[PDB]
């Protein structure tokens, strides 16, 4: 449902879908797969349906936590909610 990003989506599958299938490809070749992923660009262009398309094609565990929801009305609850994720 989203075209034109095949150049960008190809690098996403290598850093997301690829290490979740075969983990020995990075050990034999000797390349450290990126653990974190940041997505830049002006707000309202990418992201959005891209993460949903990758999560649907992977068919595995997926956790989506909003960046503004970590803070809780209680004080010490903030660091505990981050650990539970």
């Amino acid at each position: 449902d989203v075209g034109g990003l095949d150049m960008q989506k190809q690098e996403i599958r290598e850093a997301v879908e690829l290490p979740l299938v075969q983990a020995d490809l990075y050990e034999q070749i000797g390349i450290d797969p990126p653990r974190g992923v940041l997505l830049y660009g002006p707000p309202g262009t990418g992201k959005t349906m891209l993460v949903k398309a990758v999560a649907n094609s992977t068919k595995a565990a997926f956790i989506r936590v909003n960046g503004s929801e970590f803070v809780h009305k209680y004080l010490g609850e903030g660091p505990r909610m981050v650990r539970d994720v």
């Binding site: 050990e27 034999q28 070749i29 000797g30």
Partner: protein, 400 residues
């Protein structure tokens, strides 16, 4: 030095191809004379002691080589010591000034790096081992200690040391974190594969020398054509017919070597005859490869017929599954095998439980027994089960 010790052992035993005796005799008196190693010209007398076809003429006139004098003398010894004693005076003069200055850890370590190669080229073995102890304390990073592993490997190839060289090989390659570094894993596919040939492995050696990258050029130590020759040695044991048509035949690494040097007759003639399961063309390639490959190489001729026994039982097992009952005269006229030599070939295996076969001499036919059975698998666990219980009982009673 080049090749370490090869040309010195080429004259040890040669069954055929007398022309190679002249070339091997001219190479040992060339490189050693050109290099700086004094003593390695003297060891020529001690290496051929108690051997057939000795190339040393002193008390034994039976030498068949064209050049019969390898013996150590004082003419070449005096010429090599003048070059060795002159350079060590200049090396010890510059390094001594750096020891008193003590500026940085690079100049202290690099001073012993040039020495580790120098004491090996002047003929010092135990003296070069003491140089690694000083460079170990002067090591900077993990790569500095890798050069110590090279010196242990280079000096260990002369006498073929499978104990200290093989043990310290994996210690440097492991350390804390192994990783995919090219200074360790690549050398692990080469140095470790050499020690597997002396201990008669053929299993773990087939997972390195066969399947690997396309270069592994060590220059002075080994070459590309030398390592590619052993690919067909260990590749015919563990690797089944599925991997012979992929990592051996259709592998692009061996395709360029066949069109370059066709005198090997190993990775090509033996692989095609074994893949086709045709004994008619498989026989003449056994003698040609045994003479020009196994015999000259140092890590092969030590096996020689021991490695030949493994190749013959491989084709007999393939044809065994291709039929149930077959006449002895029919197979003799098909693949072109003699009847008298057929009984001697199968007589070295069947009684050893290597291959299960039934032969009826009344009608002159051969049958096929059950290759795998449930009781045959449990018999191997009897020796393995009692072998463990022996150590638990013996060593358990020792400590008490």
């Amino acid at each position: 030095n080049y090749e370490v010790s090869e040309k010195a052992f080429l004259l040890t035993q040669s069954k055929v191809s007398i022309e190679q005796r002249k070339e091997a005799a001219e190479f040992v008196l060339a490189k050693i004379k050109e290099e700086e190693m004094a003593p390695y010209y003297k060891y020529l007398c001690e290496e051929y002691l108690v051997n057939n076809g000795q190339s040393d003429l002193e008390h034994d006139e039976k030498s068949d080589s064209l050049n019969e004098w390898i013996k150590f003398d004082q003419e070449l010894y005096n010429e090599l010591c003048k070059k060795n004693e002159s350079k060590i005076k200049e090396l010890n003069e510059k390094i001594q000034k750096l020891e008193e200055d003590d500026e940085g850890e690079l100049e202290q370590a690099q001073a012993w790096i040039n020495l580790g190669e120098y004491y090996a080229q002047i003929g010092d073995k135990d003296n070069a081992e003491k140089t690694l102890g000083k460079s170990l304390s002067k090591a900077i990073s993990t790569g500095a200690k890798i050069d110590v592993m090279l010196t242990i490997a280079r000096l260990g190839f002369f006498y073929n040391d499978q104990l200290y060289v093989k043990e310290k090989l994996e210690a440097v390659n492991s350390m804390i974190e192994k990783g995919g570094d090219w200074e360790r894993r690549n050398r692990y596919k080469t140095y470790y594969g050499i020690h597997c040939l002396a201990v008669r492995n053929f299993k773990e050696a087939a997972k390195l020398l066969v399947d690997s990258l396309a270069t592994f050029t060590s220059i002075e130590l080994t070459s590309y054509e030398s390592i590619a020759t052993y690919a067909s040695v260990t590749g015919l044991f563990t690797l089944e017919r599925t991997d012979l048509k992929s990592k051996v035949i259709d592998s692009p690494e061996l395709l360029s070597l066949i069109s370059t040097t066709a005198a090997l007759q190993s990775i090509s003639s033996l692989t095609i005859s074994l893949y086709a399961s045709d004994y008619a063309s498989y026989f003449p390639y056994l003698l040609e490869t045994y003479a020009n490959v196994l015999i000259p190489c140092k890590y092969l001729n030590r096996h020689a017929d021991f490695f030949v026994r493994e190749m013959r039982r491989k084709v007999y097992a393939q044809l065994l599954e291709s039929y149930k009952t077959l006449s002895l005269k029919s197979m003799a006229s098909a693949f072109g095998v003699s009847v008298a030599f057929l009984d001697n070939d199968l007589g070295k295996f069947i009684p050893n439980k290597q291959l299960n076969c039934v032969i009826d001499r009344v009608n002159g036919i051969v049958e096929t027994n059950r290759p795998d059975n449930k009781n045959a698998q449990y018999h191997l666990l009897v020796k393995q089960g009692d072998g463990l219980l022996t150590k638990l009982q013996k060593y358990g009673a020792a400590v008490r």
